[PDB]
């Protein structure tokens with residue numbers, strides 16, 4: 001359960017902005033797997049995505065500042081099995097895919113799409129590999145600061161994003177007017193807070209009403225609801241890839257969850273079944289998660305955007321795969337080598 005922080009640019013300045021096709025001919029496709037990109041090339045890819053969506057020119061972002069901001073964001077992640085920089089990078093890449101494939105400019109303002117992308121990069125900053133309940137039970141400093149207000153980790157991720165912006169030479173919004181700077185801060189707050197599953201459960205009925213009634217580009221509340229759904233779709237986007245990706249990501253999620261469970265047992269507390277390596281049955285847990293969480297999210301995206309139908313079908317397909325592998329996976333927890341390669 002010990003996950004380190006790396007700390008407390010010239011290569012990026014020389015040629016950090018590359019045309020996206022030079023990274024991969026399939027870079028703008030829903031079939032691209034951003035986790036296949038070497039970690040050392042992710043900062044360059046973030047700049048390339050911002051350049052390709054024309055945010056650098058349109059918002060007059062200073063490249064050296066953007067380069068330092070990206071490197072600070074990357075250094076802001078610890079190394080738990082799942083909630084690390086590679087997860088934030090892939091979430092950010094999915095946000096770029098939504099922009100490239102769904103024509104978001106017809107549903108949201110350019111500033112909202114910009115905030116969505118930046119929020120994707122920052123959304124799990126300084127994650128400790130533990131959930132909100134753990135912060136409360138361990139009586140952590142983060143729970144002392146935010147438990148009374150809800151979404152302990154999410155409030156911390158936002159606070160860490162703000163601290164990066166307040167670091168000298170990293171303020172990418174420095175030249176914005178007081179009104180636009182505040183709007184960026186407000187959007188990032190709401191978008192990051194939408195990554196709390198408890199928040200998604202609370203607004204579901206309203207998201208399912210919006211899809212039923214149809215999207216209204218002049219309803220400010222519809223813009224807020226869409227941003228929440230888009231953020232959760234980016235957060236769970238590993239579920240829209242091939243079966244090898246979903247299987248590997250399930251292995252990382254449970255390595256992280258089981259370490260939290262071992263830590264709660266060492267504290268003399270009984271963990272949730274899904275966090276207990278002696279009780280958890282991963283195929284059944286993934287089928288419930290796919291059915292209750294990911295599948296309804298992508299079905300809502302399909303209802304609002306017809307081009308997103310392939311995403312839902314890919315998620316439904318990965319859920320069907322868990323049913324088929326459950327015959328070959330006959331143990332609780334993970335095998336001794338923490339790998340699901342045997343499947």
Ligand SMILES: FC(F)(F)c1ccc(C2(Nc3nc(Cl)nc4[nH]ncc34)CC2)cc1
Pocket residue numbers: 194195196197198200231232233235236253285286289293
């Ligand atoms: F809000 C939301 F965006 F929908 C969201 C919902 C769940 C989660 C996490 N929990 C999961 N639990 C299980 Cl069993 N499998 C998983 N696969 N990918 C994620 C995830 C990672 C914390 C994050 C965001």
Ligand SMILES: [Mg+2]
Pocket residue numbers: 123124195
């Ligand atoms: Mg999170």
Ligand SMILES: [Zn+2]
Pocket residue numbers: 087091123124195235
């Ligand atoms: Zn996340």
